[PDB]
Amino acid sequence: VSLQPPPQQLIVQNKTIDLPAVYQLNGGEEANPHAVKVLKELLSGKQSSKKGMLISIGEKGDKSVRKYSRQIPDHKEGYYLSVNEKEIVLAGNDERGTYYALQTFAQLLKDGKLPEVEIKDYPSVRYRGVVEGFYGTPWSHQARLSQLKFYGKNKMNTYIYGPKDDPYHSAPNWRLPYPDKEAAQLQELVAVANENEVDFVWAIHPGQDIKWNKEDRDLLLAKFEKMYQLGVRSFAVFFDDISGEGTNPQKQAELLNYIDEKFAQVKPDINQLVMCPTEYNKSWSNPNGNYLTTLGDKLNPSIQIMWTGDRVISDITRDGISWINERIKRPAYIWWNFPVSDYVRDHLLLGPVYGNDTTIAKEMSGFVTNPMEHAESSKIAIYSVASYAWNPAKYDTWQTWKDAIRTILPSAAEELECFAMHNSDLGPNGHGYRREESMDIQPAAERFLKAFKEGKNYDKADFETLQYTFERMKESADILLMNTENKPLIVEITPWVHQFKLTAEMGEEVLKMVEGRNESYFLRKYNHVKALQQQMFYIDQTSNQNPYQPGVKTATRVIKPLIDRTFATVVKFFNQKFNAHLDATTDYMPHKMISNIKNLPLQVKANRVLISPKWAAGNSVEIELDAIYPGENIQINFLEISTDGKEWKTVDLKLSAGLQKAPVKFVRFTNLRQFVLTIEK
Ligand SMILES: CCCCCN1[C@H](CO)[C@@H](O)[C@@H](O)[C@@H]1CC(=O)NC
């Protein structure tokens, strides 16, 4: 088996022992009852009695396992697991340890058969898990219930609740208790987290409008107190992405220490207390100021401080963690902003987890991932982060990705792999963060395109690889659409699956245009491609219509540019050959734009028509829409309207011109970061 996470020490013998038909259970009444419940499910159908094979379960100190005390590792959440033909031992250093032994035990089980094996295990990082900390639609209740079962299975002990658009988490209603319905749901979440050995850390994000007074201090404590009554035993205060007084390091420290002394140390049973600083990565840290060393010196040392790395989106390196730890005077609690896609919402990020140093476990208090608003889809990265964080020294990126996918979707693992490996890069974005994509076919794609562009003979093998890949892509899309094993996963990814299928069909038809040996056939494929472009645009305009990066982009890094440039090239070649004037545009645009900028394409985004973001006065620009619409405004960062081209009407900027529902078809500007017409849909 590929045990995930991989244990710290494992010795296996070529000898299997059947899951005994007859077992004596020793320590079921004293061991972690969440661990016992898991064992008893694994043993349904088998007989209990005082005869037959002994199964020893308990926490170090319990009589059930005092026998094995010096084999039980002396770490938080550590365990000893042993299988031989005589007996089974499942012995945690603590209750969570025992639960974790059962999670490893369940993976060892196959057909009703166990390998003869000896395991001593424990996590290299103390706090491991997920921070629901993104902008966008927060995870549904059902998605959260499923997350927490998944965290228990992969030994993640931490779930930090902090969805930026939950109004009771953030400003201004952080001051209000949750309504009954949500409160009842959070209470269930906390109970379920408890059953899966996950710390539910409730975060609050009061900083944008906090006053540094008695009144807001008390409301914050009253809100924590409410959460505590709901079952919450860990807490966080986040000061990220704010301006104003709330950024004050002295005051933040004083408030966290107050929470610490008057609440966290006064209750009998509060576990983590965590804060997110305002300077939460090195690039936003101001060496002109003293923000981080002030937190470092003033914040009670048991309080965690979160950190995203050298940048808002970054991977964690030795130099980076060393840089921060020196300032905050404790090991940073890593907030890793992957696979969060809230700033590239038209991309799914389903690639492997990589780039984080595997030797620096001792330098971090915790490691949590900030995932996508697509909960199930995020499990690929989550499963992987759990593997990494439990045993970084043995972290195998690619094998963990595969095991993740095979866990999440066993009936269609190879199809999900196919889809995921072409849906991993983020594309260009303000943070500069990129991931690999489509790496297996990138060299064949690069050689083919350079040869074809230059009139040299492409390698046949390269052409067949591209063919194979498009074929595989369609099979994967089609199978994934109908898969019923993980319906919520398929709901999340479906718009991208449709777009991926179309991408593959377009690719096939373009390769037929390359090989095409007569005019007529070439023309049929050309027209087919144009129709597929238009379908891609339709999906782009009707799926995933969020306000920030609407639409659906897929296979962007390698596959789409290859198809686009191949199509442009072969149409150029066809035009030269047949003295024809076929249009070589690669993305369908129903509206037109002319200028003297010329080839900055237009884009449609919701009810906006914009020029893709050059200060020469060549003289004019005109946009023609495909119909008459009521106009809202025109926005510009470094002007007339018409319905027919002939009668015009000047509008005055400010830069922003209101149109006041004036019918618009044409827009002209005479005498660029932004140039956007908003119309009424
Ligand atoms: C300019 C605002 C950037 C927001 C930065 N990150 C994420 C970007 O994915 C986003 O999920 C947001 O919640 C988070 C804030 C943050 O990084 N806190 C440690």
State how far the alpha carbon of 308 is from the alpha carbons of 200, 321, 336, in Å.
21, 10, 5
Pocket-testing residue among 165, 347, 370, 426, ligand 1, by greatest number of atoms within 8 A of Cβ: 370
Strand segments (E) across 579-619: 592-595, 602-605, 608-611
77 and 164: one domain? Answer: no
Same domain (yes/no): 269, 386: yes
Q: Among 75, 97, 122, which residue terminates a domain? A: 122
Give the sign of the dihedral formed by CA 185, CA 187, CA 192, CA 198. positive
Alpha-carbon torsion 238, 242, 245, 249, what sign? positive
Cβ atoms of 367 and 128 closer than 8 Å: yes
Considering Cα of 269, then 272, then 278, then 279, what sign does the dihedral take? positive
Output the six-digit token pair for 333: 């609690």
Which amino acid residue places its CA nearest to atom 7 of ligand 1?
Answer: 134
In 3D space, the residue among 90, 94, 101, 78 whose CA is nearest the CA of residue 54 turns out to be 90
- Reference 327, options 358, 311, 308, 305; nearest CA is 305
- Smallest Cα–Cα separation from 305: which of 263, 365, 363, 246? 365
CA atoms of 257 and 268, how far apart (whole Å): 17
Burial class from Cβ neighbours inside 10 Å (0-12, 13-18, 19+) for residue 149 reads middle
What's the CA gap between 341 and 332, in Å, rounded?
23
Nearest-10 Cα torsion for 635, 641, 644, 645: -100
User: Dmax of the chain from CA atoms?
Assistant: 98
Cβ contacts of 302 within 8 Å, gap of 6 or more: 260, 273
Q: Which single residue is written with the structure tokens 């840089």? A: 323
Q: Count of CB atoms within 10 A of residue 514's CB?
A: 18
Q: 145 and 135 share a domain?
A: yes
Q: Provide CB contacts within 8 A for 568, sequence distance 6+.
A: 584, 586
Distance (Å, whole) CA 467 – CA 478: 17
Contacts of 44 (CB under 8 A, 6+ apart): none
Q: Are residues 591 and 467 in the same domain?
A: yes
C-beta atoms surrounding 592 within 10 Å: 12
**Do the beta carbons of residue 444 and residue 376 sit within 8 Å?**
no
Closest CA to 159 of 167, 169, 168, 149: 149
Rg (CA), the chain: 29
Task: Single out the residue of 105, 81, 106 nearest to residue 93, CA to CA.
Answer: 81
Nearest alpha carbon to residue 402 among 392, 391, 411, 413: 413
Classify residue 423 by its DSSP letter. S
Residues 91, 310: Cα–Cα separation, whole Å: 40
The span from the CA of 7 to the CA of 394, in Å, is: 9
CB of 493 closer than 8 Å to CB of 549: no
| Cβ neighbours of residue 494 closer than 8 Å, sequence gap 6 or more | 481
Q: Which residues pair with 18 in a beta bridge?
A: 113
Go through 252-272 and write b for each residue having 16 or more CB atoms within 10 A of its CB, e for each that does not.
bbebbbebbeebbeeeeebeb
The length of the chain in residues reads 681
Residue 456 burial class via C-beta count within 10 angstroms: exposed 0-12, middle 13-18, buried 19 and up: exposed
What kind of experiment solved this structure? X-ray
Q: Which atom of ligand 1 is nearest to the CA of 308?
A: 19
DSSP class per residue in 210-255: --SSHHHHHHHHHHHHHHHHTT--EEEEE--S--SGGG-HHHHHHH
C-alpha closest to that of 231 among 174, 273, 191 = 191
> Do both 543 and 599 map to the same domain?
yes
CATH code at position 164: 3.20.20.80
> CA-CA distance, 72 to 457, in Å (whole number)?
65
Question: Around Cβ 442, how many Cβ atoms within 10 Å?
Answer: 15
The count of structural domains within the chain is: 3
Token pair, residue 254, equals 């004083």
Beta bridge partners of 608: 605, 678
Give yes or no: residues 420 and 391 share one domain: no
CB 389 within 8 A of CB 473: no
Residue 260 designated active-site: no
652 shares a domain with 622: yes
Q: Identity (one letter) of the amino acid at 104?
A: T
Residue type, 126: R
* 418 within 8 A of 402, measured Cβ to Cβ: no
Task: Say how many Å lie between the CA of residue 267 and the centre of ligand 1.
Answer: 32
Query: Within 10 Å of residue 460's Cβ, how many Cβ atoms?
Result: 8
For 500, the token pair is 């991926």
CA distances from 294 to 37, 320, 326 (A): 47, 19, 12
Q: Entry resolution in angstroms?
A: 2.0
Looking at residue 72, the DSSP 8-state letter turns out to be S
Specify the DSSP element, H or E, that contains 508. Answer: helix 487-515
Q: How many CA atoms lie within 13 A of 20 on its CB side?
A: 20
284 lines ligand 1 (CB under 6 A): no
Residue type, 592: K
Provide the residue range defining the domain that includes 5.
1-122
Q: Is the CB of 134 under 6 A from ligand 1?
A: yes
Distance between CA 360 and CA 124 in Å, rounded?
A: 9
Residue found by looking up tokens 């296996």 in the block: 12
Rounded to whole angstroms, the Cα distance separating 533 from 556 reads 15
What DSSP string describes 651-667?
Answer: -----EEE-TT-EEEEE
Tokens standing for 478?
């089609």
First to last CA, the chain: 55
- Point out which residues pair with 48 in neighbouring strands: 23
Instruction: Determine the atom of ligand 1 nearest the C-alpha atom of 276.
Output: 19
The 10 Å Cβ neighbour count of residue 351 is: 25
Beta bridge partners of 603: 610
Among 64, 89, 122, the domain boundary falls at: 122
Which amino acid is present at 148? L
Chain centroid offset of residue 164 CA: 15
Name the burial class of residue 111, with classes exposed (0-12), middle (13-18) and buried (19+) by CB atoms within 10 angstroms of its CB.
Answer: exposed
Cβ of 77 below 6 Å from ligand 1:
no
Q: Where do the H-state alpha helices sit in 543-628?
A: 559-578
The residues near 650 (Cβ < 8 Å, ≥ 6 apart) are 639, 640
> What whole-number distance in Å separates Cα of residue 344 and Cα of residue 429?
7
CB 307 within 8 A of CB 279: no
Distance between CA atoms of residues 3 and 402, nearest Å = 12
Q: Is 28 annotated as a binding residue?
A: no
Amino acid at 568: A
User: Do 637 and 499 belong to one domain?
Assistant: yes
Q: Is 162 helix (H, G, I), strand (E, B) or coil?
A: coil
Dihedral of CA 393/396/401/406: which sign? negative
Among 216, 241, 357, 587, the active-site one is: 241
Q: Does 168 carry a binding-site annotation?
A: no
342 lines ligand 1 (CB under 6 A): yes
Measured CA distances, 266 to 90, 202, 409, 471 (Å): 35, 18, 45, 63
Cα atoms found within 13 Å of the Cα of residue 35, Cβ hemisphere only: 31
Same domain flag for 129 and 72: no
* The one-letter amino acid at 418: C
Q: Please check whether residues 402 and 483 belong to one and the same domain.
A: no
Q: How far is the CA of 340 from the centre of ligand 1 (A)?
A: 9
**Nearest-angstrom CA–CA distance, 124 and 299:** 25
DSSP string computed for 361-384 = GGGEEEEEE---S-TTTTHHHHHH
Q: Which atom of ligand 1 is nearest to the CA of 240?
A: 18
Inter-residue contact 253 to 298 (CB < 8 Å): yes
Cα 93 to middle of ligand 1, angstroms: 37
> Whole-angstrom Cα distance, residue 74 to residue 61?
12
The Cα 57–Cα 62 span in angstroms is: 9
- Helix 141-153 to helix 379-390 angle (10° resolution) is 30
Residues 225 and 311 in one domain: yes
CATH classification of the domain holding 75 = 3.30.379.10
Residues 6+ apart with CB under 8 A from 147: 130, 139, 159, 375, 382
**In whole angstroms, what is the distance from residue 138 CA to residue 136 CA?**
6
**Both 6 and 107 in a single domain?**
yes
Q: Is 240 in the pocket of ligand 1 (CB under 6 A)?
A: yes
Last residue of a domain, one of 89, 122, 155: 122
Residue 135 CA, chain-centre distance (Å), reads: 12
Distance CA 510, CA 493 (A): 26
Name the DSSP letter for residue 386.
Answer: H
Sorted by sequence, the CB contacts under 8 Å of residue 385 that are 6+ apart come out as 128, 130, 156, 336, 353, 367, 368, 369
Atom of ligand 1 nearest to the CA of 341: 9
In whole angstroms, give the CA distance from residue 389 to residue 128: 6
| SS3 labels along 308-343 | CCCCCCCCCCHHHHHHHHHHHCCCEEEEECCCCCCC
Q: List the residue whose alpha carbon is closest to atom 11 of ligand 1.
A: 134
Can you read off the two tokens belonging to residue 509? 């038809």
Q: Which domain CATH number covers 600?
A: 1.20.58.460
